[PDB]
């Protein structure tokens, strides 16, 4: 019949052996004769829901049900390249005497994430390289390598011959500017990670420099992005057309990831059941097995997105997602105000 064919065509993305099918979106007025697709606000608000499935520090996974790709992808792009953070931008160096070149060293220092809150600082105006307390931060790095006076005669372990032969990111000292010393309590402004190796020295060599930190967005330079990686994927839903019994049940369970399929005893014989389809990676290995190609159907739900945001440590991920949502409101508000002004 046409009814179920059209329903599957308009609500499921079908994974075939050689290519995906029904990739596009077709819920617009006039495309299907029997239905109506004009925007209905109440119908959207009735069906939308969000499920938080897991969360801990520097991680977050949650679901959006009822939203469409044209919007979820906007949130993803905003997360990648429009949420602002703080990154070193200028390096004032005097007496660099290491092996690392100045340009390479400055580039390396650029990529170290900082633990300031970017919502309390303004964009630095063009020029005015000096900056001020409202739109900049300052750090100072200064380490000199010397021979250890108490070294034994082994003269073989670098960790004992020399002292401060390795420059870590914990040697950077925050230099308060203006009244920042009062607003930010001790310990809040610091590099996030504290383990990152910056360079490596030998006795007699010295590094001594100052660096200025300003505000930016990831669209400009990839060092400003607050997200390790943000992505999403559609919820899988596997369905098997006919019951599978016996060793074929084990075969089916083996053609998938460990968790999704489960085998159980009902009367003394093994019955297969699709238990937890969230966990499939779609290796599409069932199409190797000739007999089972005809008894399963692979598809994905179109209006169910599984997000996975993992932050880099500047802010907790939920705050990042909130800011990402607010940016789009900002854009459309900007254009509305512009349009009213021109009219």
């Amino acid at each position: 019949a046409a009814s179920q064919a059209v329903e599957e065509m308009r609500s499921r993305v079908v994974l075939g052996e050689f290519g995906v099918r029904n990739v596009h979106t077709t819920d617009f007025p006039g495309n299907y004769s029997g239905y109506d697709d004009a925007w209905d606000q109440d119908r959207f608000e009735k069906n939308f829901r969000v499920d938080v499935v897991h969360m801990d520090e520097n991680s977050l996974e949650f679901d959006m049900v009822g939203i469409d790709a044209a919007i979820a992808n906007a949130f993803r792009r905003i997360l990648l390249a429009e949420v602002p953070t703080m990154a070193v931008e200028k390096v004032l160096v005097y007496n660099n005497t290491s092996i690392v070149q100045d340009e390479i060293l400055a580039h390396r220092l650029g990529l170290i994430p900082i633990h300031a809150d970017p919502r309390l600082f303004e964009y630095r105006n063009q020029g005015d390289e000096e900056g001020t307390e409202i739109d900049t931060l300052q750090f100072r790095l200064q380490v000199r390598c010397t021979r250890n006076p108490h070294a034994a005669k082994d003269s073989s372990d670098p960790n004992e011959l020399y002292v401060n032969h390795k420059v870590y990111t914990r040697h950077m000292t925050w230099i308060p500017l203006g009244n920042q010393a009062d607003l930010f309590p001790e310990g809040t402004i610091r590099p996030v990670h504290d383990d990152i190796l910056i360079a490596q020295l030998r006795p007699g060599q010295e590094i001594d420099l100052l660096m200025h930190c300003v505000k930016g967005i990831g669209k400009d330079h990839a060092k400003f992005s607050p997200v390790a990686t943000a992505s999403y994927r559609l919820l899988p839903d596997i369905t098997l057309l006919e019951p599978v019994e016996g060793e074929a049940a084990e075969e089916l369970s083996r053609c998938f990831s460990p968790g999704v399929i489960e085998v159980q005893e009902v009367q003394g014989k093994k019955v297969a059941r699709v238990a937890n389809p969230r966990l499939d990676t779609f290796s599409r290995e069932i199409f190797r097995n000739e007999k089972l190609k005809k008894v399963v159907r692979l598809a994905r739900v179109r209006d169910h997105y599984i997000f996975s945001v993992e932050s880099t440590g500047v802010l907790p991920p939920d705050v990042l997602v909130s800011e990402a949502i607010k940016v789009l409101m900002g854009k459309c508000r900007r254009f509305l105000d512009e349009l009213d002004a021109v009219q």
Binding site: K90, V93, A106
Partner: protein, 46 residues
């Protein structure tokens, strides 16, 4: 006041300030390197 060149072998500061032929004051080496500059230089961390 006189300028300092670092010896290429023992790294002992030497002052020449003359047409005196190049040779280290302690060892016999014959190669010298200028010291680093004192002015500061600004880089962009990009």
């Amino acid at each position: 006041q006189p300028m300092i060149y670092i010896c290429g072998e023992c790294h002992t500061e030497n002052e020449i300030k003359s047409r005196d032929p190049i040779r280290c004051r302690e060892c016999g080496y014959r190669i010298m390197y200028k010291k680093r500059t004192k002015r500061l230089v600004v880089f962009d961390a990009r």
